[PDB]
Scaffold this active site. Structure first.
Site, PDB file in Angstrom:
ATOM      1  N   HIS A  40      64.609  42.322  45.221  1.00 19.92           N
ATOM      2  CA  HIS A  40      64.695  41.217  45.039  1.00 19.92           C
ATOM      3  C   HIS A  40      66.056  40.298  45.238  1.00 19.92           C
ATOM      4  CE1 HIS A  40      65.136  40.869  40.465  1.00 19.92           C
ATOM      5  NE2 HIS A  40      65.666  39.661  40.855  1.00 19.92           N
ATOM      6  N   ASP A  84      61.176  47.746  43.025  1.00 23.94           N
ATOM      7  CA  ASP A  84      62.410  46.617  43.159  1.00 23.94           C
ATOM      8  C   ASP A  84      63.600  47.498  43.131  1.00 23.94           C
ATOM      9  OD1 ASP A  84      63.544  44.217  43.299  1.00 23.94           O
ATOM     10  OD2 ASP A  84      62.980  43.767  41.270  1.00 23.94           O
ATOM     11  N   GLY A 175      70.476  36.554  36.890  1.00 24.07           N
ATOM     12  CA  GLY A 175      72.044  37.011  37.243  1.00 24.07           C
ATOM     13  C   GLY A 175      72.346  38.232  37.027  1.00 24.07           C
ATOM     14  N   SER A 177      69.988  40.639  37.555  1.00 28.31           N
ATOM     15  CA  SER A 177      69.251  41.518  38.370  1.00 28.31           C
ATOM     16  C   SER A 177      70.072  42.167  39.238  1.00 28.31           C
ATOM     17  CB  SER A 177      68.287  40.329  39.342  1.00 28.31           C
ATOM     18  OG  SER A 177      67.587  39.743  38.521  1.00 28.31           O
ATOM     19  N   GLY A 178      69.298  43.544  39.711  1.00 26.24           N
ATOM     20  CA  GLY A 178      70.043  44.575  40.240  1.00 26.24           C
ATOM     21  C   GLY A 178      71.067  45.385  39.575  1.00 26.24           C
TER      22      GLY A 178
END
Ligand SMILES: [Ca+2]
Length: 223
Positions: A40, A84, A175, A177-178
């Site tokens: 995402h 994801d 912020g 994420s990942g």
């Protein structure tokens, strides 16, 4: 990260920032030329920033390296966030040392109750918005699949796990994420989703990296 602590400069040496003129997501360095992040987080024109603490000040341990290619998981569903996960290749290999270092992929899936380290430059507020300039850290346990599914009925796949605190107050956030979830020195999760941040009975939901080791290894070997 809500309810976390200041990690300390370069204490999380595999933590990267993905930059497209601004920080927009975290990632994890898994060898000198490859980063794992959340699908995402995909966009074109990514610059990977390694060695960061203050993302708004050049402090002296940065490496900024443009991505040559990104590979989103072949079964990524942006509606459900199932699978994801994405790989990002650097145009040139990073220089590895104690402050910029890769994180190992798991040999085994981590279990509910294992303590993990979650890190990022995301929002530090459950209510409203405050972005830190330095890296934030959170120690949190993996939650049972039963408590995870009870928190998010109809939403948790075999490729997700929950981690954090059902009481609320401590979570990843926008912020983050990942970015990484590391347990016993291995990358077990990717910051993926949650309903708000640090809300009661709404823990963080993380991509289950142990399910993807074969895809990661095969993809790196041919790209
Ligand atoms: Ca910096």
């Amino acid at each position: 990260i809500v309810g976390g602590y200041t990690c300390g400069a370069n204490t999380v040496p595999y933590q990267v920032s993905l930059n497209s003129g601004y920080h927009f997501c975290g990632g994890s360095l898994i060898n000198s030329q490859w980063v794992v992040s959340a699908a995402h987080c995909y966009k074109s024109g990514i610059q990977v920033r390694l060695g960061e603490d203050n993302i708004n000040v050049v402090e002296g341990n940065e490496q900024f390296i443009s991505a040559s290619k990104s590979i989103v998981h072949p079964s990524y569903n942006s509606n459900t966030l199932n699978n994801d996960i994405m790989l990002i290749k650097l145009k040139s290999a990073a220089s590895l040392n104690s402050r910029v270092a890769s994180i190992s992929l798991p040999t085994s899936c981590a279990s509910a109750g294992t303590q993990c380290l979650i890190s990022g430059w995301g929002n530090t507020k459950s209510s409203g918005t405050s972005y830190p300039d330095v890296l934030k850290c959170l120690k949190a346990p993996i939650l049972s699949d039963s408590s995870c599914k009870s928190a998010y009925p109809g939403q948790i796949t075999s490729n997700m796990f929950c981690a954090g605190y059902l009481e609320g107050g401590k979570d990843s956030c926008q912020g983050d994420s990942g970015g990484p979830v590391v347990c016993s020195g291995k990358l077990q999760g990717i910051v993926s989703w949650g309903s708000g941040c640090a809300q009661k009975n709404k823990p963080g939901v993380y991509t289950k990296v142990c399910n993807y080791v074969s895809w990661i290894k095969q993809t790196i070997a041919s790209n």
